[PDB]
Design a protein around this nucleic acid. Structure first.
Ligand SMILES: [Zn+2]
Ligand SMILES: [Zn+2]
Length: 590
RNA sequence: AAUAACCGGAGAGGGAACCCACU
Protein backbone atom coordinates (compact mmCIF):
# COMPACT_ATOMS: atom_id res chain seq x y z
CA UNK A 1 0.00 0.00 0.00
CA UNK A 2 0.93 3.66 -0.43
CA UNK A 3 1.45 6.02 2.52
CA UNK A 4 1.77 9.76 1.90
CA UNK A 5 2.74 12.23 4.63
CA UNK A 6 3.02 15.92 3.65
CA UNK A 7 5.32 17.57 6.16
CA UNK A 8 4.49 20.89 4.49
CA UNK A 9 2.42 22.52 1.77
CA UNK A 10 -0.64 20.76 3.19
CA UNK A 11 -3.49 22.95 1.99
CA UNK A 12 -0.87 25.70 2.16
CA UNK A 13 2.23 26.95 0.34
CA UNK A 14 5.94 27.06 1.01
CA UNK A 15 8.38 24.69 2.70
CA UNK A 16 7.08 21.94 0.44
CA UNK A 17 8.12 18.49 1.62
CA UNK A 18 6.46 15.12 1.00
CA UNK A 19 7.25 11.67 2.39
CA UNK A 20 6.24 8.58 0.42
CA UNK A 21 6.27 5.11 1.96
CA UNK A 22 5.89 2.75 -1.01
CA UNK A 23 6.50 -1.01 -1.05
CA UNK A 24 8.38 -0.63 2.22
CA UNK A 25 10.63 2.20 0.97
CA UNK A 26 10.75 5.79 2.23
CA UNK A 27 11.51 8.56 -0.29
CA UNK A 28 11.55 12.27 0.56
CA UNK A 29 10.32 14.52 -2.25
CA UNK A 30 11.51 18.10 -1.93
CA UNK A 31 12.68 19.90 1.22
CA UNK A 32 12.54 23.69 1.36
CA UNK A 33 11.77 26.51 3.76
CA UNK A 34 9.27 29.33 3.48
CA UNK A 35 9.33 32.93 4.61
CA UNK A 36 7.06 34.43 7.26
CA UNK A 37 7.88 32.07 10.14
CA UNK A 38 11.08 33.48 11.62
CA UNK A 39 10.93 30.60 14.09
CA UNK A 40 12.24 27.15 13.18
CA UNK A 41 8.67 26.26 12.16
CA UNK A 42 9.64 27.45 8.66
CA UNK A 43 11.70 24.31 8.17
CA UNK A 44 9.86 21.00 7.78
CA UNK A 45 9.40 18.95 10.92
CA UNK A 46 11.69 15.94 11.32
CA UNK A 47 10.33 14.46 14.55
CA UNK A 48 8.04 12.19 12.50
CA UNK A 49 10.34 10.86 9.77
CA UNK A 50 12.95 9.56 12.22
CA UNK A 51 12.10 11.31 15.51
CA UNK A 52 15.57 11.67 17.09
CA UNK A 53 17.68 8.98 15.43
CA UNK A 54 19.76 8.64 12.27
CA UNK A 55 17.96 9.72 9.11
CA UNK A 56 19.68 7.41 6.63
CA UNK A 57 18.40 4.43 8.62
CA UNK A 58 14.80 5.19 7.65
CA UNK A 59 15.06 7.31 4.50
CA UNK A 60 16.11 6.03 1.09
CA UNK A 61 16.66 9.04 -1.18
CA UNK A 62 15.98 12.76 -1.42
CA UNK A 63 14.48 14.27 -4.57
CA UNK A 64 14.58 17.97 -5.50
CA UNK A 65 12.24 19.34 -8.15
CA UNK A 66 13.65 22.80 -8.92
CA UNK A 67 15.84 25.49 -7.39
CA UNK A 68 13.15 27.80 -6.02
CA UNK A 69 13.86 28.48 -2.36
CA UNK A 70 10.47 27.15 -1.18
CA UNK A 71 11.71 23.74 -2.50
CA UNK A 72 15.52 23.72 -2.34
CA UNK A 73 16.09 25.88 0.75
CA UNK A 74 16.25 23.13 3.37
CA UNK A 75 19.03 21.07 1.76
CA UNK A 76 21.84 22.39 4.00
CA UNK A 77 19.62 22.34 7.07
CA UNK A 78 18.25 18.86 6.39
CA UNK A 79 21.55 17.32 5.33
CA UNK A 80 24.19 18.95 7.56
CA UNK A 81 22.93 19.76 11.06
CA UNK A 82 20.37 16.98 11.17
CA UNK A 83 22.81 14.61 9.48
CA UNK A 84 22.25 12.80 6.19
CA UNK A 85 24.67 11.07 3.82
CA UNK A 86 22.17 9.45 1.46
CA UNK A 87 21.72 10.19 -2.24
CA UNK A 88 20.20 13.52 -3.28
CA UNK A 89 18.84 13.64 -6.83
CA UNK A 90 18.36 16.83 -8.82
CA UNK A 91 18.86 17.85 -12.44
CA UNK A 92 22.08 19.52 -13.55
CA UNK A 93 20.52 23.00 -13.87
CA UNK A 94 19.00 22.67 -10.41
CA UNK A 95 22.36 21.61 -8.99
CA UNK A 96 24.09 24.53 -10.68
CA UNK A 97 21.50 27.13 -9.65
CA UNK A 98 20.45 26.21 -6.10
CA UNK A 99 23.89 26.89 -4.51
CA UNK A 100 23.89 30.58 -5.43
CA UNK A 101 20.35 31.10 -4.16
CA UNK A 102 21.14 29.20 -0.96
CA UNK A 103 24.21 31.36 -0.35
CA UNK A 104 22.19 34.52 -0.97
CA UNK A 105 19.47 33.36 1.42
CA UNK A 106 22.15 32.52 4.00
CA UNK A 107 23.59 36.03 3.71
CA UNK A 108 20.11 37.56 3.91
CA UNK A 109 19.35 35.56 7.05
CA UNK A 110 22.62 36.72 8.60
CA UNK A 111 21.92 40.34 7.70
CA UNK A 112 18.27 40.45 8.83
CA UNK A 113 17.52 37.64 11.30
CA UNK A 114 20.98 36.45 12.30
CA UNK A 115 19.74 33.06 13.55
CA UNK A 116 22.50 31.39 15.60
CA UNK A 117 21.68 27.87 14.38
CA UNK A 118 21.96 28.55 10.66
CA UNK A 119 23.88 26.65 8.00
CA UNK A 120 27.21 28.13 6.89
CA UNK A 121 28.91 28.47 3.52
CA UNK A 122 31.27 25.58 4.25
CA UNK A 123 28.25 23.46 5.16
CA UNK A 124 26.40 24.33 1.93
CA UNK A 125 29.51 23.28 0.02
CA UNK A 126 29.64 20.01 1.95
CA UNK A 127 25.94 19.37 1.32
CA UNK A 128 26.18 20.04 -2.41
CA UNK A 129 29.19 17.73 -2.66
CA UNK A 130 26.68 14.98 -1.81
CA UNK A 131 24.45 15.50 -4.86
CA UNK A 132 23.76 13.22 -7.82
CA UNK A 133 22.69 14.45 -11.25
CA UNK A 134 19.81 13.33 -13.47
CA UNK A 135 19.13 14.11 -17.12
CA UNK A 136 15.78 14.09 -18.89
CA UNK A 137 14.12 10.67 -18.99
CA UNK A 138 17.21 9.05 -17.44
CA UNK A 139 16.11 6.19 -15.18
CA UNK A 140 18.46 6.17 -12.19
CA UNK A 141 18.51 3.04 -10.02
CA UNK A 142 18.57 4.25 -6.42
CA UNK A 143 18.91 0.59 -5.46
CA UNK A 144 18.22 -2.84 -6.95
CA UNK A 145 14.45 -2.22 -7.07
CA UNK A 146 13.78 1.52 -6.71
CA UNK A 147 14.28 3.72 -9.78
CA UNK A 148 13.55 7.39 -10.41
CA UNK A 149 12.79 9.07 -13.72
CA UNK A 150 12.74 12.78 -14.55
CA UNK A 151 10.73 14.83 -17.05
CA UNK A 152 10.69 18.31 -18.53
CA UNK A 153 8.48 20.63 -16.48
CA UNK A 154 9.31 24.25 -17.29
CA UNK A 155 8.25 25.97 -14.07
CA UNK A 156 11.78 27.33 -14.33
CA UNK A 157 14.85 26.20 -16.21
CA UNK A 158 15.52 22.64 -15.11
CA UNK A 159 12.25 22.06 -13.27
CA UNK A 160 11.13 18.46 -13.58
CA UNK A 161 8.40 16.04 -12.67
CA UNK A 162 9.50 12.76 -11.11
CA UNK A 163 8.09 9.27 -11.56
CA UNK A 164 9.01 7.11 -8.56
CA UNK A 165 8.37 3.56 -9.73
CA UNK A 166 8.88 0.22 -7.99
CA UNK A 167 7.76 -3.00 -9.63
CA UNK A 168 4.29 -2.09 -10.84
CA UNK A 169 3.47 0.54 -8.21
CA UNK A 170 4.34 4.08 -9.28
CA UNK A 171 3.78 7.62 -8.00
CA UNK A 172 4.18 10.74 -10.13
CA UNK A 173 5.12 13.93 -8.27
CA UNK A 174 4.91 17.06 -10.39
CA UNK A 175 5.84 19.77 -7.96
CA UNK A 176 5.72 23.21 -9.55
CA UNK A 177 5.14 22.98 -13.31
CA UNK A 178 3.63 24.86 -16.24
CA UNK A 179 1.57 23.61 -19.16
CA UNK A 180 1.45 26.90 -21.09
CA UNK A 181 4.64 27.30 -23.15
CA UNK A 182 6.58 30.43 -22.30
CA UNK A 183 8.89 32.51 -24.48
CA UNK A 184 11.96 30.50 -23.47
CA UNK A 185 10.75 27.32 -21.69
CA UNK A 186 8.73 24.57 -23.30
CA UNK A 187 5.58 23.16 -21.79
CA UNK A 188 5.74 20.16 -19.49
CA UNK A 189 5.37 16.83 -21.28
CA UNK A 190 4.79 13.32 -19.97
CA UNK A 191 4.18 9.75 -21.07
CA UNK A 192 1.00 7.76 -20.50
CA UNK A 193 2.46 6.16 -17.38
CA UNK A 194 -0.90 5.46 -15.69
CA UNK A 195 0.41 5.89 -12.14
CA UNK A 196 -1.55 4.81 -9.10
CA UNK A 197 -0.97 8.15 -7.36
CA UNK A 198 -0.26 11.65 -8.68
CA UNK A 199 0.91 14.53 -6.49
CA UNK A 200 0.29 17.94 -8.04
CA UNK A 201 0.13 21.62 -7.20
CA UNK A 202 -2.93 23.88 -7.20
CA UNK A 203 -1.37 27.34 -6.96
CA UNK A 204 -3.78 28.59 -9.65
CA UNK A 205 -6.45 25.90 -9.59
CA UNK A 206 -9.27 28.48 -9.49
CA UNK A 207 -7.90 30.79 -12.21
CA UNK A 208 -8.13 29.86 -15.89
CA UNK A 209 -5.17 31.91 -17.10
CA UNK A 210 -6.14 33.78 -20.25
CA UNK A 211 -4.29 33.94 -23.57
CA UNK A 212 -0.66 34.58 -22.66
CA UNK A 213 0.07 35.87 -26.16
CA UNK A 214 -2.52 38.63 -25.84
CA UNK A 215 -1.42 39.39 -22.28
CA UNK A 216 2.14 40.03 -23.44
CA UNK A 217 0.78 41.97 -26.42
CA UNK A 218 -0.85 44.34 -23.94
CA UNK A 219 2.36 44.51 -21.92
CA UNK A 220 4.37 45.46 -25.01
CA UNK A 221 1.87 48.10 -26.08
CA UNK A 222 2.10 49.69 -22.65
CA UNK A 223 5.90 49.70 -22.65
CA UNK A 224 5.99 51.16 -26.16
CA UNK A 225 3.64 54.02 -25.34
CA UNK A 226 5.55 54.62 -22.11
CA UNK A 227 8.87 54.97 -23.93
CA UNK A 228 7.14 57.23 -26.47
CA UNK A 229 5.85 59.61 -23.78
CA UNK A 230 9.43 60.19 -22.59
CA UNK A 231 8.80 58.70 -19.17
CA UNK A 232 10.87 55.96 -17.59
CA UNK A 233 10.02 52.30 -17.02
CA UNK A 234 10.79 50.38 -13.83
CA UNK A 235 10.05 46.65 -13.85
CA UNK A 236 10.49 44.88 -10.47
CA UNK A 237 10.97 41.13 -10.85
CA UNK A 238 13.09 38.79 -8.76
CA UNK A 239 16.35 38.07 -10.51
CA UNK A 240 15.57 34.46 -11.46
CA UNK A 241 12.86 33.15 -13.74
CA UNK A 242 10.49 35.87 -14.89
CA UNK A 243 13.37 38.33 -15.31
CA UNK A 244 14.96 36.40 -18.16
CA UNK A 245 11.61 35.79 -19.86
CA UNK A 246 10.85 39.51 -19.81
CA UNK A 247 14.38 40.17 -21.04
CA UNK A 248 14.00 37.83 -24.03
CA UNK A 249 10.59 39.21 -24.98
CA UNK A 250 11.69 42.83 -24.77
CA UNK A 251 14.99 42.16 -26.54
CA UNK A 252 13.35 40.45 -29.51
CA UNK A 253 10.60 43.05 -29.88
CA UNK A 254 13.26 45.70 -29.43
CA UNK A 255 15.55 44.41 -32.16
CA UNK A 256 12.58 44.10 -34.50
CA UNK A 257 11.31 47.64 -33.96
CA UNK A 258 14.94 48.81 -34.16
CA UNK A 259 14.40 51.14 -31.21
CA UNK A 260 17.58 52.58 -29.71
CA UNK A 261 16.70 53.72 -26.18
CA UNK A 262 19.19 51.93 -23.90
CA UNK A 263 17.78 49.42 -21.43
CA UNK A 264 19.43 48.30 -18.20
CA UNK A 265 19.18 45.12 -16.15
CA UNK A 266 19.77 45.04 -12.40
CA UNK A 267 23.28 43.92 -11.47
CA UNK A 268 24.24 41.41 -8.78
CA UNK A 269 22.44 38.32 -10.06
CA UNK A 270 22.96 39.07 -13.76
CA UNK A 271 26.54 37.79 -13.86
CA UNK A 272 25.30 34.34 -12.80
CA UNK A 273 21.79 34.19 -14.26
CA UNK A 274 22.93 34.98 -17.79
CA UNK A 275 25.94 32.67 -17.56
CA UNK A 276 23.84 29.70 -16.47
CA UNK A 277 21.07 30.42 -18.97
CA UNK A 278 23.84 30.55 -21.57
CA UNK A 279 25.65 27.33 -20.64
CA UNK A 280 22.38 25.38 -20.26
CA UNK A 281 20.85 25.82 -23.70
CA UNK A 282 19.62 22.20 -23.94
CA UNK A 283 16.63 22.93 -21.74
CA UNK A 284 15.27 26.14 -23.28
CA UNK A 285 12.70 24.90 -25.81
CA UNK A 286 12.67 24.67 -29.58
CA UNK A 287 12.94 28.32 -30.60
CA UNK A 288 16.17 29.00 -28.72
CA UNK A 289 17.71 25.55 -29.06
CA UNK A 290 17.36 25.86 -32.83
CA UNK A 291 18.28 29.53 -33.30
CA UNK A 292 21.43 28.75 -31.29
CA UNK A 293 23.24 27.66 -34.46
CA UNK A 294 23.75 31.21 -35.75
CA UNK A 295 23.61 33.36 -32.61
CA UNK A 296 23.04 32.76 -28.90
CA UNK A 297 19.91 34.50 -27.67
CA UNK A 298 21.36 34.90 -24.19
CA UNK A 299 24.25 37.05 -25.42
CA UNK A 300 22.26 40.29 -25.35
CA UNK A 301 23.09 43.03 -27.85
CA UNK A 302 21.07 45.84 -26.24
CA UNK A 303 20.76 44.82 -22.56
CA UNK A 304 23.67 46.10 -20.48
CA UNK A 305 24.49 45.99 -16.78
CA UNK A 306 22.69 48.69 -14.82
CA UNK A 307 24.40 51.48 -12.90
CA UNK A 308 22.93 53.17 -9.84
CA UNK A 309 24.11 56.63 -10.89
CA UNK A 310 22.03 56.38 -14.07
CA UNK A 311 18.87 56.78 -11.98
CA UNK A 312 18.99 60.56 -12.50
CA UNK A 313 19.75 60.30 -16.22
CA UNK A 314 17.15 62.11 -18.37
CA UNK A 315 15.26 60.83 -21.38
CA UNK A 316 12.98 57.80 -21.53
CA UNK A 317 14.54 54.65 -20.10
CA UNK A 318 13.74 51.00 -19.41
CA UNK A 319 15.22 49.32 -16.33
CA UNK A 320 14.60 45.97 -14.73
CA UNK A 321 15.02 45.80 -10.98
CA UNK A 322 15.01 43.50 -7.97
CA UNK A 323 13.38 42.16 -5.89
CA UNK A 324 9.89 41.37 -7.13
CA UNK A 325 8.61 41.65 -3.56
CA UNK A 326 9.96 45.18 -2.90
CA UNK A 327 10.46 44.32 0.79
CA UNK A 328 14.08 45.52 0.64
CA UNK A 329 13.85 47.05 -2.80
CA UNK A 330 16.92 48.10 -4.68
CA UNK A 331 14.06 48.61 -7.12
CA UNK A 332 12.30 50.51 -4.34
CA UNK A 333 15.25 52.91 -4.38
CA UNK A 334 14.48 54.08 -7.91
CA UNK A 335 10.77 53.87 -7.09
CA UNK A 336 11.26 56.40 -4.28
CA UNK A 337 13.52 58.45 -6.55
CA UNK A 338 10.83 58.79 -9.23
CA UNK A 339 7.62 58.48 -7.19
CA UNK A 340 6.74 62.14 -7.67
CA UNK A 341 6.68 62.02 -11.46
CA UNK A 342 3.41 60.99 -13.10
CA UNK A 343 5.05 60.26 -16.47
CA UNK A 344 6.78 57.03 -15.45
CA UNK A 345 5.16 53.59 -15.45
CA UNK A 346 5.73 50.62 -13.19
CA UNK A 347 4.59 47.04 -13.76
CA UNK A 348 4.05 44.44 -11.03
CA UNK A 349 3.70 41.16 -12.95
CA UNK A 350 3.10 39.00 -9.88
CA UNK A 351 1.28 38.66 -6.58
CA UNK A 352 2.63 40.74 -3.70
CA UNK A 353 2.93 39.56 -0.11
CA UNK A 354 -0.07 40.79 1.87
CA UNK A 355 0.69 43.22 4.68
CA UNK A 356 3.93 44.52 3.13
CA UNK A 357 5.01 47.47 1.00
CA UNK A 358 4.04 45.16 -1.84
CA UNK A 359 0.42 45.23 -0.70
CA UNK A 360 0.58 48.95 0.08
CA UNK A 361 1.58 49.65 -3.52
CA UNK A 362 -0.90 47.03 -4.77
CA UNK A 363 -3.65 49.09 -3.19
CA UNK A 364 -4.10 52.43 -4.92
CA UNK A 365 -3.75 54.78 -1.95
CA UNK A 366 -1.23 57.55 -2.53
CA UNK A 367 0.16 57.39 1.02
CA UNK A 368 2.29 54.22 0.97
CA UNK A 369 5.00 53.59 3.57
CA UNK A 370 4.57 58.36 4.94
CA UNK A 371 5.31 59.15 1.29
CA UNK A 372 2.86 59.64 -1.58
CA UNK A 373 3.13 57.60 -4.79
CA UNK A 374 2.06 59.40 -7.97
CA UNK A 375 3.39 57.45 -10.96
CA UNK A 376 1.14 54.83 -12.53
CA UNK A 377 1.13 51.16 -11.55
CA UNK A 378 -0.10 48.26 -13.67
CA UNK A 379 -0.77 44.95 -11.92
CA UNK A 380 0.16 42.40 -14.59
CA UNK A 381 0.24 38.61 -14.19
CA UNK A 382 3.17 36.79 -15.82
CA UNK A 383 3.26 33.85 -13.40
CA UNK A 384 4.68 30.56 -14.66
CA UNK A 385 2.32 28.28 -12.72
CA UNK A 386 -0.41 25.81 -13.72
CA UNK A 387 -3.88 27.01 -14.65
CA UNK A 388 -6.97 24.95 -13.85
CA UNK A 389 -7.20 23.79 -17.45
CA UNK A 390 -3.50 22.94 -17.27
CA UNK A 391 -3.95 20.69 -14.26
CA UNK A 392 -7.02 19.04 -15.77
CA UNK A 393 -5.23 18.41 -19.07
CA UNK A 394 -2.13 17.03 -17.35
CA UNK A 395 -4.13 14.64 -15.19
CA UNK A 396 -6.13 13.56 -18.23
CA UNK A 397 -2.94 12.87 -20.18
CA UNK A 398 -1.22 10.94 -17.39
CA UNK A 399 -4.46 9.02 -16.79
CA UNK A 400 -3.77 8.31 -13.10
CA UNK A 401 -6.03 6.53 -10.64
CA UNK A 402 -5.71 8.83 -7.62
CA UNK A 403 -4.67 12.45 -7.15
CA UNK A 404 -3.27 14.43 -4.24
CA UNK A 405 -3.07 18.22 -4.09
CA UNK A 406 -0.49 20.39 -2.34
CA UNK A 407 1.12 23.81 -2.85
CA UNK A 408 -1.97 25.98 -2.54
CA UNK A 409 -4.93 27.19 -0.51
CA UNK A 410 -7.57 25.02 1.16
CA UNK A 411 -10.62 26.60 -0.47
CA UNK A 412 -9.18 26.36 -3.98
CA UNK A 413 -8.10 22.84 -3.03
CA UNK A 414 -11.77 22.12 -2.34
CA UNK A 415 -13.05 23.63 -5.57
CA UNK A 416 -10.50 21.71 -7.61
CA UNK A 417 -11.25 18.44 -5.82
CA UNK A 418 -14.97 18.83 -6.38
CA UNK A 419 -14.49 19.60 -10.07
CA UNK A 420 -12.01 16.79 -10.69
CA UNK A 421 -14.08 14.17 -8.87
CA UNK A 422 -17.16 15.19 -10.84
CA UNK A 423 -15.19 15.22 -14.10
CA UNK A 424 -12.73 12.33 -14.28
CA UNK A 425 -14.33 9.95 -11.71
CA UNK A 426 -10.98 9.76 -9.85
CA UNK A 427 -10.21 9.60 -6.14
CA UNK A 428 -8.81 12.75 -4.55
CA UNK A 429 -7.51 13.88 -1.17
CA UNK A 430 -6.49 17.00 0.70
CA UNK A 431 -3.87 16.09 3.28
CA UNK A 432 -3.29 18.75 5.89
CA UNK A 433 0.33 19.17 6.87
CA UNK A 434 1.27 16.27 9.12
CA UNK A 435 -1.64 14.01 8.09
CA UNK A 436 -0.79 10.60 6.65
CA UNK A 437 -3.05 9.11 3.97
CA UNK A 438 -3.05 5.43 3.00
CA UNK A 439 -4.16 3.99 -0.34
CA UNK A 440 -4.44 0.34 -1.45
CA UNK A 441 -2.14 -1.07 -4.11
CA UNK A 442 -2.54 -3.84 -6.70
CA UNK A 443 0.73 -5.81 -6.31
CA UNK A 444 0.27 -8.36 -9.10
CA UNK A 445 3.05 -10.94 -8.78
CA UNK A 446 4.92 -11.76 -12.02
CA UNK A 447 5.51 -15.26 -13.33
CA UNK A 448 7.47 -17.09 -16.01
CA UNK A 449 5.97 -19.28 -18.73
CA UNK A 450 7.01 -21.70 -21.46
CA UNK A 451 6.83 -20.34 -25.00
CA UNK A 452 5.20 -23.26 -26.80
CA UNK A 453 2.15 -23.51 -24.55
CA UNK A 454 1.39 -19.84 -25.09
CA UNK A 455 2.02 -20.18 -28.82
CA UNK A 456 -0.49 -22.98 -29.33
CA UNK A 457 -3.03 -21.42 -26.97
CA UNK A 458 -2.86 -18.18 -28.95
CA UNK A 459 -3.23 -20.14 -32.19
CA UNK A 460 -6.38 -21.72 -30.76
CA UNK A 461 -7.64 -18.29 -29.73
CA UNK A 462 -6.93 -17.00 -33.23
CA UNK A 463 -9.07 -19.81 -34.60
CA UNK A 464 -12.72 -18.67 -34.76
CA UNK A 465 -13.69 -20.47 -31.54
CA UNK A 466 -13.38 -17.44 -29.25
CA UNK A 467 -15.94 -16.42 -26.62
CA UNK A 468 -16.03 -20.10 -25.64
CA UNK A 469 -13.89 -20.55 -22.49
CA UNK A 470 -10.75 -22.40 -23.60
CA UNK A 471 -9.65 -22.56 -19.94
CA UNK A 472 -5.96 -21.73 -20.04
CA UNK A 473 -4.54 -24.47 -17.81
CA UNK A 474 -1.24 -25.80 -16.53
CA UNK A 475 0.55 -25.62 -13.20
CA UNK A 476 2.75 -23.12 -11.39
CA UNK A 477 6.12 -24.46 -10.27
CA UNK A 478 7.27 -22.43 -7.26
CA UNK A 479 10.89 -22.12 -6.14
CA UNK A 480 10.30 -19.03 -3.93
CA UNK A 481 12.59 -17.32 -6.48
CA UNK A 482 11.34 -17.97 -10.04
CA UNK A 483 7.66 -18.86 -10.24
CA UNK A 484 7.26 -20.53 -13.63
CA UNK A 485 4.00 -21.59 -15.24
CA UNK A 486 4.26 -24.79 -17.29
CA UNK A 487 2.04 -27.18 -19.19
CA UNK A 488 0.97 -30.52 -17.73
CA UNK A 489 3.31 -32.70 -19.80
CA UNK A 490 6.23 -30.31 -19.39
CA UNK A 491 5.76 -30.34 -15.62
CA UNK A 492 5.53 -34.14 -15.72
CA UNK A 493 8.85 -34.47 -17.53
CA UNK A 494 10.52 -31.77 -15.41
CA UNK A 495 9.53 -33.36 -12.10
CA UNK A 496 10.05 -36.94 -13.29
CA UNK A 497 6.70 -38.15 -11.97
CA UNK A 498 5.01 -41.04 -13.73
CA UNK A 499 2.23 -40.25 -16.21
CA UNK A 500 -0.59 -42.06 -14.43
CA UNK A 501 -3.27 -43.36 -16.79
CA UNK A 502 -6.85 -43.85 -15.60
CA UNK A 503 -9.00 -46.22 -17.71
CA UNK A 504 -12.73 -47.02 -17.27
CA UNK A 505 -14.33 -49.97 -19.08
CA UNK A 506 -18.12 -50.10 -18.86
CA UNK A 507 -20.11 -53.22 -19.76
CA UNK A 508 -23.12 -51.98 -21.73
CA UNK A 509 -25.85 -54.64 -21.72
CA UNK A 510 -27.83 -54.71 -24.98
CA UNK A 511 -31.09 -56.67 -24.89
CA UNK A 512 -32.25 -57.40 -28.44
CA UNK A 513 -32.58 -60.30 -30.87
CA UNK A 514 -29.99 -58.93 -33.31
CA UNK A 515 -26.96 -61.12 -33.91
CA UNK A 516 -23.81 -60.56 -31.87
CA UNK A 517 -21.63 -60.42 -35.00
CA UNK A 518 -23.53 -57.40 -36.32
CA UNK A 519 -23.63 -55.74 -32.88
CA UNK A 520 -20.33 -53.93 -33.43
CA UNK A 521 -21.41 -52.75 -36.88
CA UNK A 522 -24.69 -51.50 -35.39
CA UNK A 523 -22.75 -49.65 -32.69
CA UNK A 524 -20.50 -48.03 -35.29
CA UNK A 525 -23.43 -46.98 -37.49
CA UNK A 526 -25.45 -45.62 -34.55
CA UNK A 527 -22.53 -43.66 -33.08
CA UNK A 528 -21.57 -42.19 -36.46
CA UNK A 529 -25.19 -41.11 -36.98
CA UNK A 530 -25.65 -39.66 -33.47
CA UNK A 531 -22.29 -38.05 -32.65
CA UNK A 532 -22.01 -35.55 -35.49
CA UNK A 533 -18.53 -34.24 -36.36
CA UNK A 534 -17.00 -36.97 -34.17
CA UNK A 535 -14.20 -39.26 -35.33
CA UNK A 536 -16.18 -42.51 -35.61
CA UNK A 537 -14.33 -45.38 -37.27
CA UNK A 538 -14.81 -49.14 -37.62
CA UNK A 539 -11.51 -50.91 -37.05
CA UNK A 540 -10.62 -53.95 -39.20
CA UNK A 541 -10.84 -56.17 -36.09
CA UNK A 542 -14.55 -55.40 -35.64
CA UNK A 543 -14.14 -52.83 -32.87
CA UNK A 544 -15.36 -49.22 -33.01
CA UNK A 545 -13.41 -46.06 -32.18
CA UNK A 546 -15.06 -42.76 -31.21
CA UNK A 547 -12.25 -40.26 -30.67
CA UNK A 548 -10.31 -42.20 -28.00
CA UNK A 549 -13.17 -44.41 -26.73
CA UNK A 550 -12.94 -48.04 -27.86
CA UNK A 551 -16.15 -50.09 -28.11
CA UNK A 552 -15.64 -53.86 -28.33
CA UNK A 553 -18.27 -56.58 -28.67
CA UNK A 554 -17.21 -58.82 -25.79
CA UNK A 555 -17.34 -62.60 -25.92
CA UNK A 556 -20.83 -64.13 -25.69
CA UNK A 557 -22.20 -64.09 -22.15
CA UNK A 558 -24.15 -66.81 -20.35
CA UNK A 559 -27.37 -64.81 -20.91
CA UNK A 560 -28.58 -65.37 -24.55
CA UNK A 561 -30.70 -62.21 -24.44
CA UNK A 562 -27.86 -59.97 -23.23
CA UNK A 563 -24.88 -58.77 -25.28
CA UNK A 564 -21.87 -57.20 -23.56
CA UNK A 565 -20.21 -54.14 -25.11
CA UNK A 566 -16.98 -53.03 -23.44
CA UNK A 567 -16.72 -49.25 -23.76
CA UNK A 568 -13.19 -48.39 -22.63
CA UNK A 569 -12.01 -44.80 -22.27
CA UNK A 570 -9.38 -42.68 -20.58
CA UNK A 571 -10.04 -40.07 -17.91
CA UNK A 572 -9.30 -37.19 -20.29
CA UNK A 573 -12.06 -38.28 -22.68
CA UNK A 574 -14.20 -39.60 -19.83
CA UNK A 575 -16.83 -36.97 -20.66
CA UNK A 576 -17.38 -38.50 -24.09
CA UNK A 577 -17.05 -41.99 -22.61
CA UNK A 578 -19.83 -41.31 -20.12
CA UNK A 579 -21.95 -39.74 -22.86
CA UNK A 580 -21.44 -42.85 -25.02
CA UNK A 581 -22.39 -45.11 -22.11
CA UNK A 582 -25.54 -43.07 -21.41
CA UNK A 583 -26.52 -43.18 -25.09
CA UNK A 584 -25.89 -46.94 -25.29
CA UNK A 585 -27.90 -47.54 -22.11
CA UNK A 586 -30.91 -46.58 -24.24
CA UNK A 587 -30.01 -49.49 -26.53
CA UNK A 588 -29.11 -49.72 -30.19
CA UNK A 589 -31.75 -49.02 -32.86
CA UNK A 590 -33.92 -52.04 -33.63
C1' A B 1 9.03 33.13 -3.70
C1' A B 2 14.57 36.54 -1.66
C1' U B 3 18.16 41.74 -2.59
C1' A B 4 23.57 46.98 -4.53
C1' A B 5 27.99 43.34 1.66
C1' C B 6 35.01 49.45 -0.37
C1' C B 7 33.43 47.81 -6.43
C1' G B 8 42.28 49.94 -7.69
C1' G B 9 39.58 49.01 1.96
C1' A B 10 47.97 52.64 0.40
C1' G B 11 51.83 54.79 4.23
C1' A B 12 56.12 54.42 4.49
C1' G B 13 60.09 53.27 9.90
C1' G B 14 66.27 53.38 12.45
C1' G B 15 70.17 56.04 13.75
C1' A B 16 75.17 57.41 14.62
C1' A B 17 80.15 58.29 13.52
C1' C B 18 83.87 58.56 9.83
C1' C B 19 86.02 59.40 5.08
C1' C B 20 85.42 61.00 0.10
C1' A B 21 83.54 64.43 -3.80
C1' C B 22 80.76 68.80 -5.91
C1' U B 23 79.83 75.26 -4.61
ZN1 LIG C 1 8.41 26.95 -7.39
ZN1 LIG D 1 6.70 26.79 -5.11
Amino acid sequence: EIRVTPLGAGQDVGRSCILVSIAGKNVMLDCGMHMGFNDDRRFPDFSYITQNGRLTDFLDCVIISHFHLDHCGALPYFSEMVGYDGPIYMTHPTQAICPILLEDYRKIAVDKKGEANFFTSQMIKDCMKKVVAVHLHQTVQVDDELEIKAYYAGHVLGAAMFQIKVGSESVVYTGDYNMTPDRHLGAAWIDKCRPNLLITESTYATTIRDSKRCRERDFLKKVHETVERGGKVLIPVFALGRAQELCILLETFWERMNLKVPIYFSTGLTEKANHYYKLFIPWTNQKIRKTFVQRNMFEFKHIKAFDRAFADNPGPMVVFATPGMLHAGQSLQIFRKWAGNEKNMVIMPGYCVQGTVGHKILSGQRKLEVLEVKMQVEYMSFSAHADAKGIMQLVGQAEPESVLLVHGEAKKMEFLKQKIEQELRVNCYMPANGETVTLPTSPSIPVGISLGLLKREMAQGLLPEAKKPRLLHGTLIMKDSNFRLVSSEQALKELGLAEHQLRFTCRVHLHDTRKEQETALRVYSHLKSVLKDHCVQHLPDGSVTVESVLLQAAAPSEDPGTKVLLVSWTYQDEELGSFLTSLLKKGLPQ
